[PDB]
Amino acid sequence: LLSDKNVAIIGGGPVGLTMAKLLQQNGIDVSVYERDNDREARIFGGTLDLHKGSGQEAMKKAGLLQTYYDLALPMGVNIADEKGNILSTKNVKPENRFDNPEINRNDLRAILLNSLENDTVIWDRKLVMLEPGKKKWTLTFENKPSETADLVIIANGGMSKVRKFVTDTEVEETGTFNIQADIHHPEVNCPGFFQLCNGNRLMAAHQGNLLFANPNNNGALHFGISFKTPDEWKNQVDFQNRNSVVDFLLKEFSDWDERYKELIRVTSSFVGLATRIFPLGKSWKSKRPLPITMIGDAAHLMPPFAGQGVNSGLMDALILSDNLTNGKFNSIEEAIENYEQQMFIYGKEAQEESTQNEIEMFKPDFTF
């Protein structure tokens, strides 16, 4: 199918890099175009864990499952209330230690980058436009020379603006909002909350405000505070202004234990982000001018609160890469169609669980 042809993957996130590995290890000529300036760019966010049957199956097929295991950390979960009482402690039993250990996102990028041949990823390449030719796409990048490919795979995340050859679907806001931050040396800077986590991830919910924390993301504490988007914000917190963010959060958390307030007070900077979804519904465009598809969040971005996210994208890469290389399809288009039909099933399943969970967890009286 791909002999004497080449593949362009747009985006070097965990899904795109996994895509590249699974193609390249079957002898496919594939490049990844990534907007990040270079591989040393820090990725902001919590940890990821990979699941048996999906994310771990993609690593296994790439020969990287042990590498993931060696850099990942099994973590228990504590459920606390707003007063700081631990309502539930579930540690990881040894027989479950491979189920879904947490890995830092930069560590995961490094594993995948190290598995690829040199110069597979072309850095500082922000795709802005695609144009189909007779047999090859032309790729236009921001202030860089163009490239061509027989097959384009869109893998550049939930806010991709290069989707229109595949679908007219637009991303949507779901109505919840997320504030995220890191605390370095949390054992010094938020000792009370750090000891509350006690090596476990911690979650707590009270009157429509949700808090989730990881006390040990490669030595830092990552936490997220989520809530229904305030109506006053429709169409007011400047997240560049930590003093404005601290003031808002301290009002929201006014009846939470001081160990939670300390987290807010000592945070150096905050990142805010509306929850969004790229909804799978009616089929994507049929009879596209040249072969093109999408994987990962570009295909099915969904709320993250129940753990859906990267694993459905890693499934995409596993399925699409097998269809493109197993010699069973008469054309790249047919291989793509088969992947998309499968992804519509498990992707819709995951989106409905994520949306249902979001409705439930943000009811004003929810508790874990």
How far apart, in whole angstroms, are the C-alpha atoms of residue 277 and residue 303? 6
Least CB distance to ligand FDA at residue 327 (A): 27
* Nearest-angstrom CA–CA distance, 344 and 337: 11
Q: By CB under 6 A, name the binding residues for ligand FDA.
A: 10-16, 33-36, 46, 48, 125-127, 155-157, 178, 180, 224, 273, 296-297, 304, 307, 309-311, 313
Q: How far is the CB of 53 from ligand A1IVL (least distance, A)?
A: 12
Backbone angles phi, psi at 268, to 5 degrees: -75, -40
Stretch that binds ligand A1IVL, among 30-38, 155-163, 302-310, 348-356 (CB under 6 A): 302-310
What span, in angstroms and rounded, lies between the C-alpha atoms of 144 and 147?
9
Is 315 among the residues that bind ligand A1IVL (CB under 6 A)? no
For the chain, list the strands marked E by DSSP. 6-10, 29-33, 48-49, 77-80, 86-90, 102-103, 121-122, 127-132, 137-141, 144-149, 151-154, 172-183, 201-206, 209-217, 220-228, 271-277, 292-294
| Minimum gap (Å) between residue 316 Cβ and ligand FDA | 8
- Please name which of 20, 69, 19, 77 lies closest in space to residue 49, comparing C-alpha atoms: 69
Instruction: Report d(CA 347, CA 5) in Å as an integer.
Output: 29
Determine the Cα–Cα distance for residues 163 and 293; give it in Å rounded to an integer: 9
Q: Is 42 annotated as a binding residue?
A: yes
Tokens of 359: 């409705």
Asked whether position 18 contacts ligand A1IVL by CB under 6 A, the answer is: no
Return the percent helix, strand and coil in the chain, to nearest 5: 35, 25, 40
Would you count residue 212 as binding ligand A1IVL (CB under 6 A)? yes
How many residues appear in the chain? 368
The sign of the torsion formed by the CA atoms of 40, 42, 55, 126 equals negative
Which of ligand FDA, ligand A1IVL, none does residue 267 bind to, with CB < 5 to 8 Å depending on kind? Answer: none
Select the binding partner of residue 212 from ligand FDA, ligand A1IVL, none (C-beta < 5 to 8 A, by kind).
ligand A1IVL
State yes or no: residue 224 binds ligand A1IVL (CB under 6 A).
Answer: yes
Contact 323, 337 (CB under 8 A): no
Figure out which of the listed residues 171, 307, 322, 344 binds ligand A1IVL, where binding follows CB under 6 A: 307
Q: Which residue, 210 or 295, is less far from ligand A1IVL as judged by CB? A: 210
Of residues 240-299, which lie at the interface with ligand A1IVL (CB under 6 A)?
none
> Quick one: 2 or 75, whose CB is closer to ligand FDA?
75
Joined together, the tokens standing for residue 98 give 């491979």
**Is residue 45 within 8 Å of residue 297, measured between CB atoms?**
no
Of 193, 183, 355, nearest to 277 by C-alpha is: 355
To the nearest whole angstrom, how small is the minimum distance from the Cβ of residue 88 to ligand FDA? Answer: 19
C-alpha R_g of the chain: 21
CB of 106 or CB of 207, closer to ligand FDA: 106
Which partner in ligand FDA, ligand A1IVL, none is near 320 (CB below 5 to 8 A by kind)?
none
Identify what 34 binds: ligand FDA, ligand A1IVL, none; CB under 5 to 8 Å per kind.
ligand FDA
| Residues 93-132: x where in contact with ligand A1IVL by CB under 6 A, - otherwise, as a string | -------x--------------------------------
Pick from ligand A1IVL, ligand FDA, none: which does 155 bind, CB < 5 to 8 A by kind?
A: ligand FDA
Binding residues for FAD: 49, 105, 297
Residues of this chain that bind ligand A1IVL (CB under 6 A): 49, 100, 178, 203, 210, 212, 224, 226, 304-305, 307
Binding residues: 42, 49, 105, 297
